[PDB]
Amino acid sequence: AQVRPPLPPFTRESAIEKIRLAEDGWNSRDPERVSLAYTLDTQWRNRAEFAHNREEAKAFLTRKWAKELDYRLIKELWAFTDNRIAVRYAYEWHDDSGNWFRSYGNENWEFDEQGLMARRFACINDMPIKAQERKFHWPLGRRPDDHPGLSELGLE
Amino acid sequence: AQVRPPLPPFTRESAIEKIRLAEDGWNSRDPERVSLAYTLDTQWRNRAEFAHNREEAKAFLTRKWAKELDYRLIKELWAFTDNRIAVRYAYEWHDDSGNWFRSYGNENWEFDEQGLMARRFACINDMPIKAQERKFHWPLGRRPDDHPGLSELGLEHH
């Protein structure tokens, strides 16, 4: 890509917007679309796996959604400083077997002047849940404007 | 009636200090000592496990170090805002079957006015490593001031 606003340094509002746009992107479960938000030579650590460029990042995303079905995500701001944002998130999905999980994650982002993400450090843990325990409800895609956020679902 | 500085809101400097003190605490592998840094009604989610008070947190730590042998930790600041700190970290250890691991974590902290942590959200992933891949070698306990941090060690992968 070339430029994707908001651009750093972030303010509380622009950081929250940056996060919402990212959330919408991942809720599309489209590797190509999602990959465009990252630098060509983006550096990633997703769990115990690493990516060293946008192409490897996209490859990971393709594997990801071939595994995590009916994926629904919610991201929320934790803290931000200059060109860095710390985000908390959770997503619900079911595997090929049909069993459900809620994944809890913390991702730390760093953006270049063009608004593209140069570094992504994400740690995620999967917790099995019963189908009736799903908390995220909305048509696959962008989370509706009025759907409660991460801290409003009593996840803690 | 505890008071544990640095106190919020944090500055870059005090946030780094807060993190270093926490790292020293966990590197003691002492459940009681570490538990005192959290509020009596502290709320935690560590991986897929939850704790709802200091006692439950302490019980978790007791299980943790009975399992994660020869544990060595390094924490580093990512970002901070008001009474919240976002931390990146890694710890090396081995299980009692001889398997070594390097665990990568991202933990987000929220402190009360007295510097005690009221909320802890930690996500951690484990990468199996060979003993020869170990990067942390200091005597069990506090990391020497002369020892490189996460940034000085650089990206840690096979």
Resolved by: X-ray
Is the Cβ of A85 closer than 8 Å to some Cβ of chain B?
A: yes
φ, ψ of residue A95 in degrees (nearest 5): -85, 180
Contacts of A43 in chain B (CB under 8 A): 155
Chain-chain contact of A108 with B125 (C-beta, under 8 angstroms)? no
How crowded is residue B69: how many other Cβ atoms within 10 Å of its Cβ?
12
Task: Calculate how close chain B gets to A31, using CA atoms only, in Å.
Answer: 23
By C-alpha distance, the chain B residue nearest A48 is B127
What pairs with residue A107 in β-bridges?
A: A87, A122
Q: State how far residue A139 is from chain B, nearest Cα, in angstroms.
A: 26
When scoring B78, B108, B121, B126 by the number of chain A Cβ atoms within 10 A, the one with the most, hence best to mutate, is B78
Please indicate whether, in this complex, the C-beta atoms of A80 and B78 are within 8 angstroms of each other. no
CB A23 within 8 A of CB A141: no
- Amino acid A71 reads Y
What tokens does B138 get? 């200091």
Residues A93 and A70 sit within 8 Å (Cβ to Cβ): yes
> Encoding tokens for residue B134?
């170990």
- Residue A105, phi then psi, degrees to nearest 5: -140, 160
Residue A81 tokens read as 């400083």
Distance CA B20, CA B150 (A): 12
Structure tokens at A66: 């071939």
Other C-beta atoms closer than 10 Å to the C-beta of B56 total 16
Is A129 in CB contact (< 8 Å) with chain B?
no
Asked if residues B47 and B124 have their Cβ atoms less than 8 Å apart, the reply is: yes
Side chain identity at A23, as an amino acid letter? E
In the DSSP assignment, the letter for residue B29 is: T
Q: What is the DSSP letter of B154?
A: -
Containing H/E element for B40?
strand B38-46
Half-sphere exposure of B34 (CA within 13 A, CB side): 23
DSSP B113: T
Peptide bond into A128 cis (omega under 30): no
Count CB neighbours of A76 within 10 A. 16
Give SS3 for B61: helix
**Cα B120–Cα B121–Cα B125 angle in degrees, nearest 5:** 130
* Residue B88 three-state SS: strand
Give the residue from A102, A105, A106, A110 showing the smallest Cα distance to A68.
Answer: A102
Q: Vertex A65, ends A99 and A149: CA angle to 5°?
A: 75
Give CA–CA dist A7/A72, Å, rounded.
Answer: 26
Tell me, letter by letter, the H, E, C secondary structure of chain A. CCCCCCCCCCCHHHHHHHHHHHHHHHCCCCHHHHHCCEEEEEEEEECCEEECCHHHHHHHHHHHHHHCEEEEEEEEEEEEECCEEEEEEEEEEECCCCCEEEEEEEEEEEECCCCCEEEEEEEEEEEEECHHHCCCCCCCCCCCCCCCCHHHCCCC
Instruction: Give the Cα separation of B4 and B57 in Å (integer).
Output: 18
Q: How far is CA B119 from CA B13, B56, B88, B109, B138, in A?
A: 21, 13, 16, 6, 30
d(CA B46, CA A69): 24
Q: Which of B119, B125, B150, B151 to mutate to test the interface with A (most CBs of A within 10 A)?
A: B125
Q: What CATH number belongs to B11-154?
A: 3.10.450.50
**Pair B51, A81: CB distance under 8 Å:** no
> Residue A39 in contact with residue A118, Cβ under 8 Å?
yes
**CB-CB contact of A8 with A83 (8 Å):** yes
The tokens of A86 are what? 């710390």
Q: Are A42 and A58 in contact (CB under 8 A)?
A: no
Å resolution of this model? 1.5
Q: Which of B13, B41, B45, B158 to mutate to test the interface with A (most CBs of A within 10 A)?
A: B45
A17 in B contact zone (CB under 8 Å): no
Omega before B8 cis (within 30°)?
no
Question: How many interface pairs between A and B have CB atoms less than 8 angstroms apart?
Answer: 87
Do residues A98 and A92 touch, judged by C-beta distance below 8 A? no
**Cβ proximity of A123 and A47 under 8 Å:** yes
For chain B, give every domain's residue range: 11-154
